[PDB]
Amino acid sequence: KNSLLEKRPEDVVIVAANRSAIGKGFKGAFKDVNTDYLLYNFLNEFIGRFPEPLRADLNLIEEVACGNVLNVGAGATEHRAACLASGIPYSTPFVALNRQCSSGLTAVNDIANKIKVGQIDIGLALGVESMTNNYKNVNPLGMISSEELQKNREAKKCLIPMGITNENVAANFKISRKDQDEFAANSYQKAYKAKNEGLFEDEILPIKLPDGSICQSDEGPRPNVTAESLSSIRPAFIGTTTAGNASQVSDGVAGVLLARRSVANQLNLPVLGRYIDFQTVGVPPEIMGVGPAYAIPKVLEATGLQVQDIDIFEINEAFAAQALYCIHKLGIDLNKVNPRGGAIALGHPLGCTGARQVATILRELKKDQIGVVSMCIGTGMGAAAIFIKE
Amino acid sequence: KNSLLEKRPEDVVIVAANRSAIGKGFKGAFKDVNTDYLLYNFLNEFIGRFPEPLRADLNLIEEVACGNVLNVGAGATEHRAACLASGIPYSTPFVALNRQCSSGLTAVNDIANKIKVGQIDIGLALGVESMTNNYKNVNPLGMISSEELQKNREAKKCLIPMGITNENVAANFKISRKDQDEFAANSYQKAYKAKNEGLFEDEILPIKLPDGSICQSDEGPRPNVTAESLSSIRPAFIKDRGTTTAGNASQVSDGVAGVLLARRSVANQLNLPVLGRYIDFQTVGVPPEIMGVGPAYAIPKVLEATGLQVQDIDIFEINEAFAAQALYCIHKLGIDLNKVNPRGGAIALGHPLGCTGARQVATILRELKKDQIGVVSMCIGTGMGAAAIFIKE
């Protein structure tokens, strides 16, 4: 702990971290634009809000890693194109990564390890998803081509709809609908509330739409949500899982600029916080929602921290059931989890979430406080990273 | 350099590294099978040959990073599903990466960095591509959606056909059709020899086809090719004035490749054999319009990072996207043709996109003798280059 708290020149620090507002998939803010447009417009704003010495030499950025789940090729061609257009020079390399729901956080881990091994000094981690425009790339009949794989016992599990996996968790550890709806309404309340106080204002960057409008306020949170109001809601997969209690389908983008500390100090770049560690573990795909239950304990153990050492937890709300289970299995103080609201209220744009949670967390922690970002991952995994506010 | 030759416990070593044969696209062995089926079959055999410790506890593998360029989502869902089918437990995580033509080597760098930072002790890097079955996913009109980005001066450079960026290189640096044809036949010459001498039988693992037959020999190196014979081919991208043709460019194909890496100390503790070690990897960006010059810049970057010099390299495996860019890099580097793609390049064996970077490691290993130093490098669509250094053990 105290040693974690010490600042070292080799630390991987966060210089800037921002997100666009999250538009509702299909009918929301970003429905008529794709990931290439989100990313370009987002970077234009992000780069503007970067520190002078950087805006003036984007060549100092040595790698761009961008998480994306639904585009062909995870969007590498169009995203590199968009970074090129925003002014990040051709000389800066680009890599697309897809680790499903955690892609945006996995991008932060990629740039952090590159800085740690000396491969680069400064790098950009991004996350972007347009579920509205790419939801369709996924063949409703599953993405496994082979007959035998399709009939293979293990392989087949990567075919269980995420919703059903959440039904397994609820059923399995007996998770009540009331429990789920209360969690959900609770989520809506804190989001709406934090949204109204402008708590997101620092983190959000506006994106003007082609047709001139401008999106800068999260679309999902509403005021007045309650457990019984959510109780009207029908089951969406089979069934305690309903639209009211699952993350909303959305569109968004987010980014985190990272550097070694001694380098940022040399360039005199402001440091908002630092990355401490990241770990991933696989879990049975049929109950993928329990990923954080195993990933959180892994990263705490690797860093020698305990739950009670964490001030804030940003555990993605893929669905109420899964979130509940993890909070509960680990013994986390409810009031510490997603205190400005979660994906149930805010929305879950697949590849963007991991980085988006990083932008969120930094405004929720005070100086010297420690936070964890974690999420379950389709196909059976969990990821968790720890950060310290500077 | 004698320093580099010194074996440290924290070194990232290569325990196993192999590839499937490379199928010609649309017409080849793998034509009716997808990346899921290839990776499954290939893992069934690569794992089959792992040391005793690992096969009995595949949980020792703490990460699988798989490079892929054309599948939706870079194939994460279906490749994780194939790893599962193969016996790698649900507990081992999986990540898909797309760094275009260098995806398979980028996957090596990813696993190496994780082991270097203590995040894992043993990881598997894969590279897989069924261009026959996913070529269809790329829209011929371009993958950039926004009209605004489509007319952007820098963004549109990501829509110039690879074959045309090659014409840009050939013309900008006056590299003759004859020269391109020179380099290419030779390349064809080497794979042939090497295919016949049995020199890939080592690295190659056989794939069982649904029909029951078994693919296990590389479909691309053509019998008795020769230069002037190539000279009869028509330009492929620019009518009657271009120099790139189907004879001097990589062949479209399908293939899968894997490299199991571990920290030296853990390999020693579990008694895993070491084929050689990874020393470093660097990537750089170059103008997308002439993306083929990538190795020319990335090679110098990794040599420098490791304190080596071109002269210190015994074998260079520089991907042959096209003869013109390949000739340019080798020459801009002053490298001796004799040390390049000794058993033949991509012009002859195929460039199954996502698989190549890993494929090349399986190849370069069998080509270096104990203690020799190798470099793996490639130009990358959308303007980049990557290069890594390996040491045979």
UniProtKB/Swiss-Prot annotation, chain B:
Keyword Acyltransferase: yes
Top EC class of this enzyme: transferase
Reaction catalysis annotation: an acyl-CoA + acetyl-CoA = a 3-oxoacyl-CoA + CoA
Keywords of this entry: Acyltransferase, Fatty acid metabolism, Lipid metabolism, Mitochondrion, Peroxisome, Transferase, Transit peptide
SUPFAM superfamilies in the cross-refs: Thiolase-like
GO CC terms: mitochondrial intermembrane space; peroxisomal matrix; peroxisome
GO molecular function, one term: acetyl-CoA C-acyltransferase activity
Family recorded in the similarity comment: Belongs to the thiolase-like superfamily. Thiolase family.
PANTHER family tied to this protein: 3-KETOACYL-COA THIOLASE, PEROXISOMAL
Protein name: 3-ketoacyl-CoA thiolase, peroxisomal
The organism of origin for this protein: Saccharomyces cerevisiae (strain ATCC 204508 / S288c) (Baker's yeast)
